[PDB]
């Protein structure tokens, strides 16, 4: 089938890369290898890995020619690798996020930032695409190559795009905490995001995770109470939150606070946890891969996860 054809082609390409003729001219080995790549891409151009590996090979060759001092062939093969990326996203895979990103990173590594901005915006201009990850990668590039202020602009652009999902908020907040070491901005971003996506369990869990690891008991408990009592998180979508709360109390609280939280949780899920009190108790004691029960005991208890 198609997987067999792909493997055959990659083995032919690897053979050519092994320089069976023992030529000493790297330009000739590269011409032969790229020829094999071209024949392959003629019929397997819908496989993104082949474009990527071909571009990577051309870049590697360019570097090897630069080390030997042949700057002209180095520049030639560098530009031709760029064109490999361009052809890959221009036909067949016009919507492949992975190759757009690879292209962006290649042009970033050549210090051609204008071309990077064009690539990310070309991708963003395709209407029927989820741009969230696109904005995340674009913010990463902006921050690390142009600075905090360029990153904040990309984040602004992401919020104004009605297709964007909550992850960019998470990313921006974490970026401010990890790169700028600024907890106040991190907080404000998480809070704006909470106003907009407080009914999404994965978002709320991200904020909870960030704050918990700040290691301030009162702030953590306050956030737990805010999210679980007020807020928009469906009560039937809150199980993981309660679990994190029980683990927080098990780490910093006493048996009384743990039992209070356990009982509030059970109330919230009185129906779903009928007769499952012992299976829940298991999670009062488990740590990492240590359980208080054997696998057979756990199955007989109705234990899940």
């Amino acid at each position: 089938q198609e997987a067999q054809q792909v493997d055959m082609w990659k083995k032919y390409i690897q053979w050519e890369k092994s320089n069976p003729l023992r030529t000493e001219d790297q330009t000739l080995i590269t011409k032969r290898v790229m020829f094999a790549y071209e024949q392959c891409l003629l019929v397997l151009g819908h496989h993104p890995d082949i474009w990527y590996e071909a571009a990577q090979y051309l870049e590697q060759s360019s570097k090897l020619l630069a080390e030997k001092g042949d700057m002209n062939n180095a520049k030639l093969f560098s530009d031709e690798a760029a064109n490999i990326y361009e052809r890959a996203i221009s036909t067949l895979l016009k919507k492949n996020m992975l190759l757009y990103f690879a292209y962006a990173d290649y042009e970033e590594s050549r210090m051609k930032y204008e071309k990077v901005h064009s690539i990310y915006n070309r991708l963003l201009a395709i209407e029927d695409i989820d741009p969230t990850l696109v904005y995340i990668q674009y913010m990463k590039f902006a921050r690390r190559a142009e600075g905090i202020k360029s990153g904040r602009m990309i984040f602004k652009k992401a919020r104004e795009d009605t297709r964007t999902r909550h992850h960019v908020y998470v990313t921006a907040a974490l970026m401010e905490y990890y790169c700028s070491k600024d907890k106040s901005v991190a907080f404000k971003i998480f809070e704006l995001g909470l106003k907009k996506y407080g009914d999404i369990p994965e978002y709320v869990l991200a904020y909870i995770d960030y704050l918990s690891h700040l290691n301030e008991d009162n702030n953590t408990r306050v956030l737990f109470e805010r999210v679980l009592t007020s807020g928009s998180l469906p009560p039937e979508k809150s199980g993981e939150i309660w679990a994190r709360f029980l683990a927080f109390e098990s780490n910093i609280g006493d048996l009384a606070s743990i039992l209070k939280v356990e009982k509030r949780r059970f109330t919230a899920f009185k129906e779903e946890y009928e007769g499952k009190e012992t299976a829940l108790l298991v999670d009062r004691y488990k740590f990492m891969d240590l359980y208080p029960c054997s696998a057979s005991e756990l199955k007989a208890l109705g234990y899940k996860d």
């Binding site: 904040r152 602004k156 919020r159 901005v185 404000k188 971003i189 704006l192």
Partner: peptide, 9 residues
């Protein structure tokens, strides 16, 4: 607008 961005940073 510039108000949300001012509040954030």
């Amino acid at each position: 607008g510039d108000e949300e961005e001012e509040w954030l940073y």
